[PDB]
Amino acid sequence: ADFEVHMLNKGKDGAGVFEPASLKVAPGDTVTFIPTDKGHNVETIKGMIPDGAEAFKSKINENYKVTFTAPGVYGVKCTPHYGMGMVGVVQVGDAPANLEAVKGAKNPKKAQERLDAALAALGN
Numbered sequence: 001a002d003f004e005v006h007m008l009n010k011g012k013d014g015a016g017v018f019e020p021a022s023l024k025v026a027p028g029d030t031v032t033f034i035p036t037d038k039g040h041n042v043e044t045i046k047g048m049i050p051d052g053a054e055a056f057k058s059k060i061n062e063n064y065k066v067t068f069t070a071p072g073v074y075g076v077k078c079t080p081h082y083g084m085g086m087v088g089v090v091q092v093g094d095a096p097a098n099l100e101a102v103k104g105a106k107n108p109k110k111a112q113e114r115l116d117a118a119l120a121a122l123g124n
């Protein structure tokens with residue numbers, strides 16, 4: 001299955017948001033990160049990627065597809081706007097084994113607040 005995540009800032013919190021900021025997918029599912037507003041990208045949050053998964057980083061304003069295979073929770077950020085809290089979570093599969101590791105990862109305060117909420121919005 002494919003999903004879409006829009007990268008927005010006009011009329012939105014901070015310097016921008018991912019919408020949805022929390023997604024539950026299956027191995028092999030693809031998420032397209034869409035530059036609906038300009039100025040954004042998507043990148044792996046170091047410390048919030050399962051083993052078995054590669055990191056990624058898109059270009060600013062790139063329409064960017066990521067295929068998620070390894071089970072677990074993935075934290076993602078917008079590179080320039082990470083400090084301002086532009087982050088999201090993608091969960092691959094049920095019962096993510098790396099949940100405790102990712103809950104303990106360090107992030108800027110505004111990012112951490114949104115990640116904590118996003119993890120709880122996946123029913124974790």
Ligand SMILES: [Cu+2]
Pocket residue numbers: 015016017039040041078079080081086
């Ligand atoms: Cu951004």
